[PDB]
Amino acid sequence: GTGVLTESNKKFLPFQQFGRDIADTTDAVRDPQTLEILDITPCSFGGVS
Amino acid sequence: TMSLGAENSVAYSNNSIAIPTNFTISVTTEILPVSMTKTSVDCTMYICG
C-alpha cells in the first residue's frame, strides 16, 4: 500500500493483525517485529484550480 | 379505514350571510431546501485507488 503511518489508540485484541474500513481497505496494522498498532492515513490529495 | 376530516353542512340559504366580527393574526412556518452538500469525486482515484 501507500500512506502515512502513525501510532494509534485502537484497542486491538491479541488475535487481530489489522483493521478494515467500510471500503474494505486496511486502515490500521500490527507491526510484525515490534507489536505496536499503527494507523494508516492516505497520502493527501485534492483538485488543483 | 382512514378519516378524511369532520363533516360540515354549511348553513346555506338564498338570503343568509355570515360575517366575521373579529380576527386572529396567525404566524406559520414554511421550510424549503435550497442546496445540497457540494461533493466532488475523482473517478480515477475512486476506480483505481
Ligand SMILES: *[C@@H]1O[C@H](CO)[C@@H](O)[C@H](O)[C@H]1NC(C)=O
Ligand atoms: C521478533 O519479533 C517478535 C514478534 O513477531 C517479537 O516478539 C520479538 O521481540 C522480536 N525480537 C527482536 C529481537 O526484536
Ligand SMILES: *[C@@H]1O[C@H](CO)[C@@H](O)[C@H](O)[C@H]1NC(C)=O
Ligand atoms: C376579539 O378577540 C380578542 C381575543 O383575540 C378579544 O379580547 C376581543 O374582546 C374580541 N373582540 C370582539 C369585538 O369580540
